[PDB]
Structure 1
Amino acid sequence: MQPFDSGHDDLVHDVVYDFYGRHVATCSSDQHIKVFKLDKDTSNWELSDSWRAHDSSIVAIDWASPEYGRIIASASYDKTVKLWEEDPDQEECSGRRWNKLCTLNDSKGSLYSVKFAPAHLGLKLACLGNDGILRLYDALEPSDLRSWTLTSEMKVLSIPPANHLQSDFCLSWCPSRFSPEKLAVSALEQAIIYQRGKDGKLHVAAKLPGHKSLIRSISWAPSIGRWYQLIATGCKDGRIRIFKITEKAELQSNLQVELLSEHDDHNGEVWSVSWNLTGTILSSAGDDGKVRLWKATYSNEFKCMSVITA
């Protein structure tokens, strides 16, 4: 557990890898985005660029697919999503290495999660804030990546949550190009799987049951070729719910939800859950100060492994 200091003056909120795994982008409450690179010679995380992005605390950033370039989206509490393209003819650690592309001002609420779509669906994007509205933005103009048009606008929640109540919203796409377009959308305590119907509009496809309290993180397991899709869920309870999704009106194919396993090992709130490249290791972080790794041994049932305390 070698630590490296990122250099933020406040709480680091979202850290995300890129596709190649040699770049990390960290956003924090100091209204800054820092991109770090891993040199093959020094083998240490060195800062590439740090620049001020928003007027509030940035809470969600995501990398785009590398076939569309170097694009970083960024969601903050100032109700904006800003897109950042990198021009390589600029100096590192200067603040001008990443150029702004667009501001998505359509959100009437502080945004919580932004996830890019898989590359086979285009240069799409997803938004979710404290107004219950799921917004999809597409880059339909190929000449310039500054005109991102809103395509879909759903309503996950009937009314926005109150000012004094905490809320959490998480997003997860389905990284399979051999299945219809899906989007795992988490409300306060509701988890919804969407589908793109034949009419070109998103429809409610399945609902993951349970979830007695707030959902902190949703992670779709990568489609390695298996016939079942796996969704991991971290709740405000101590529950790490893993759903087994099998796929076979105005939807391309119906799909069923089976709760594969449910674990109470954290005795707290599972703040984040994440998958591996192959979807064989499940990393969960809770309030016990422990990061637990999970694997499936001898069957489909997931069992615990190495526990990392911090």
Structure 2
Amino acid sequence: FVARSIAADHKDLIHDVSFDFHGRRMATCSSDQSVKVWDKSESGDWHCTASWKTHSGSVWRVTWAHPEFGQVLASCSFDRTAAVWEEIVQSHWVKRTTLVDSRTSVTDVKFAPKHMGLMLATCSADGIVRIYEAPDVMNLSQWSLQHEISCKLSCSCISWNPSSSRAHSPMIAVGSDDSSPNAMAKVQIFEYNENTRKYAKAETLMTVTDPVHDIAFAPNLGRSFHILAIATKDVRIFTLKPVRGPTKFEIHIVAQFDNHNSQVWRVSWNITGTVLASSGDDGCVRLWKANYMDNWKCTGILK
């Protein structure tokens, strides 16, 4: 493995980088209140294409949407809002809407899987998470609010479940962050209940007490169960098997990795969903893979 340093030309901390659907574009954001888009070239070089200002607060998580709807982005910032920026044909990015409903700063925003239309979820610091929908696909300005859930605790991360089957109802994971010495769980699972058309309470991870800092669902591609990842002070991987109200689950723990000797900040899966990645305060990136017998082991250390 080799590295290629890229001139960020930012004025503050970069928070997230997200990749395009086809892997040729990537978007960056920072607490300097801006968003930049880089595209790869013929000689594998990266150069900037757009450097416009988006919000008036520190810009957190920035995501890409499926190009079936066009080249449409999203973002959240210290401004208690959320945007649905779009690129139109020289070309430039123009705003389409601004969802302003939360009294506290919005932390994370994640697009839904394709097979349920165009949706958008945002978690707020006060503990409210809300799902939006845009039934009129061709104009990304008629956004509507469909559901609202209360988490009874601060919200820090959100992750959708990409299971494309019709035997899995949609489900969303909520990552808490409160550090108050009162124990209690952090991660919770919310499951759609199409019988009643509302999101219910499915399961709650009781074995998680330390602050959760990032969360992620594993791509399925054919798997018959669900795999979860959690970015606590350690790295944990969970397995959830539905038994044939919400469905009843079986929660097992597979990995209890603690060779970062630090606080784990991020987690990220692959496309085929067989290798995991994570970064901690130590400063390097680890890769974990299964040794064909439900026995994970480290397969590289990138720094």
Q: TM-score, normalised by structure 2?
A: 0.92
1:307/1:144 Cα in 2 relative to 1: closer, same or farther (>3 Å)?
same
Structure 1 stretches of at least 4 aligned residues deviating more than 4 Å after TM superposition: none
Conserved in 2, the CA contact under 8 Å of 1:133 and 1:156?
yes
Pairing partner for 1:32 from 31, 34, 43 = 34
Distance in 1 between the 2:196 and 2:204 partners?
21
Conserved in 1, the CA contact under 8 Å of 2:24 and 2:39?
yes
Conserved in 2, the CA contact under 8 Å of 1:243 and 1:257?
yes
Distance in 2 between the 1:44 and 1:37 partners?
8
Deviation of 1:211 after TM superposition, in Å, equals: 2.2
Alignment of 1:191 onto 2:168: no
What residue in structure 1 maps to residue 161 of structure 2?
174
What whole-Å deviation, never above 9, does each CA across 1:60-86 have from its counterpart, x for those lacking one?
111111111111010101101011111
- The letter for the 2-side match of 1:222 is P
What's the secondary structure of 1:90's corresponding residue? coil
Pairing partner for 1:110 from 102, 105, 109 = 105
Distance in 2 between the 1:78 and 1:135 partners?
17
Alignment of 1:132-171 (within 5 A): 132-157=127-152, 169-171=156-158
Distance in 1 between the 2:239 and 2:257 partners?
15
What residue in structure 2 maps to residue 10 of structure 1?
12
Distance in 1 between the 2:108 and 2:169 partners?
22
Alignment of 1:20 onto 2:16: no
Deviation of 1:137 after TM superposition, in Å, equals: 0.8
- The letter for the 1-side match of 2:5 is P
Deviation of 1:263 after TM superposition, in Å, equals: 1.0
Alignment of 1:306 onto 2:300: yes
Conserved in 2, the CA contact under 8 Å of 1:247 and 1:254?
yes
Deviates more, 1:282-291 or 1:138-147: 138-147
What's the secondary structure of 1:122's corresponding residue? coil
What whole-Å deviation, never above 9, does each CA across 1:148-198 have from its counterpart, x for those lacking one?
10111101125xx5xxxxxx6111100012111011111226111111102
Unaligned 5+ residue runs, structure 2?
178-184
What residue in structure 2 maps to residue 164 of structure 1?
none
How large is the Cα RMSD of the aligned pairs?
1.4
Count of residue correspondences: 290
What residue in structure 2 maps to residue 56 of structure 1?
57
Distance in 2 between the 1:136 and 1:229 partners?
22
What whole-Å deviation, never above 9, does each CA across 1:258-295 have from its counterpart, x for those lacking one?
11121111111000011010111111101112211111
Conserved in 1, the CA contact under 8 Å of 2:226 and 2:241?
yes
What's the secondary structure of 1:233's corresponding residue? strand
Q: State the percentage of identical aligned residues.
A: 39
Alignment of 1:269 onto 2:263: yes
What whole-Å deviation, never above 9, does each CA across 1:8-48 have from its counterpart, x for those lacking one?
11111111112111111101011100011112x12111112
Deviation of 1:143 after TM superposition, in Å, equals: 4.6
Distance in 2 between the 1:187 and 1:260 partners?
21
